[PDB]
Design a protein around this ligand. Structure first.
Ligand SMILES: [Zn+2]
Lengths: 9, 274
């Protein structure tokens, strides 16, 4: 359940 | 060749650009007085670093939220719709809508100022969520966001009337899926004949990669303090950069369009409604 990210995912 | 801001204005008046898609970030809302809590100091930032935060981004991560939701709700109290008015940047986008030029407005913001400015929900994609609805983190029941305002404004963690679990507004946290309405980008960005990007550093994905989804012939106009994202490291021949204060950049384009006094009138009328 992933998708949003910033500066590292 | 190399386009100017004047050239963009000419394409808008000439309705050669009649399907504008817009991407916006935190930079269009600080002029409304929304504190830029991303900025070290000033000041909510420093008051909010007093919690046992591992990193500042954990305020928008579920594992930490389950541990301690108080940091999030402190910040929510202050970003919550009802305390701030839209500024000229928002009303410029409403004016494009009034003129039938706005295909879609893609926003990273959760302050809800796009809707408040008079842009209808059908023309908007709130890609990182909204305070307009909430969800019990335990039983998953949905609620109208109004149901928790009073708790939020009163420094109380809102809890579910069914299971007493913590109710979380429908903000997209890092690691969470974006709403399925985000898939409108598959149709909207190819249909765009002009792309505006306002007030963002393009550091959050997948939102930031939308800058690449317009067709090869389509100008991309950035109004931003800095050159960022694909406009910096993957420039195209019809890219235009109006670097500086976002409000200043917008007002300059409004002037080249010939809309300065229509804007003034629009802003005065709509803010007065409060
Ligand atoms: Zn519940």
């Amino acid at each position: 359940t992933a998708r949003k990210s910033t500066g590292g995912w | 060749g190399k386009l100017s801001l004047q050239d963009v204005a000419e394409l808008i008046r000439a309705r050669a650009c009649q399907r504008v898609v817009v991407m916006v970030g935190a930079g269009i809302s600080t002029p409304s007085g929304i504190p830029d809590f991303r900025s070290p100091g000033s000041g909510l930032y420093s008051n909010l670093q007093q919690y046992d935060l591992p990193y500042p981004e954990a305020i928008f991560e579920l594992p930490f939220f389950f541990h301690n939701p108080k940091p999030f709700f402190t910040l929510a109290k202050e970003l919550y719709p009802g305390n701030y008015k839209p500024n000229v940047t928002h009303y410029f986008l409403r004016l494009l809508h009034d003129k039938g030029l706005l295909l879609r407005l893609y926003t990273q913001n959760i302050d809800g100022l796009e809707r408040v400015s008079g842009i209808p929900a059908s023309k908007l994609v709130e890609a990182h969520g909204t305070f307009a609805s909430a969800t019990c983190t335990v039983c998953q029941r949905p609620f109208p966001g109004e149901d928790i305002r009073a708790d939020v404004m009163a420094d109380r963690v809102p809890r579910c009337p069914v299971c007493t679990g913590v109710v979380k507004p429908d903000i997209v946290f890092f690691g969470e899926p974006l709403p399925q309405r985000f898939l409108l980008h598959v149709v909207d960005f190819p249909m765009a004949d002009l792309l505006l990007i306002l007030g963002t550093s393009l550091e959050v994905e997948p939102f930031a990669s939308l800058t690449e989804a317009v067709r090869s012939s389509v100008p991309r106009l950035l109004i931003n303090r800095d050159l960022v994202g694909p406009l910096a490291w993957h420039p195209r021949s019809r890219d235009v950069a109006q670097l500086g204060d976002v409000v200043h950049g917008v007002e300059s384009l409004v002037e080249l369009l010939g809309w300065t006094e229509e804007m003034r009138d629009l802003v005065q009328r709509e803010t007065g409604k409060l």
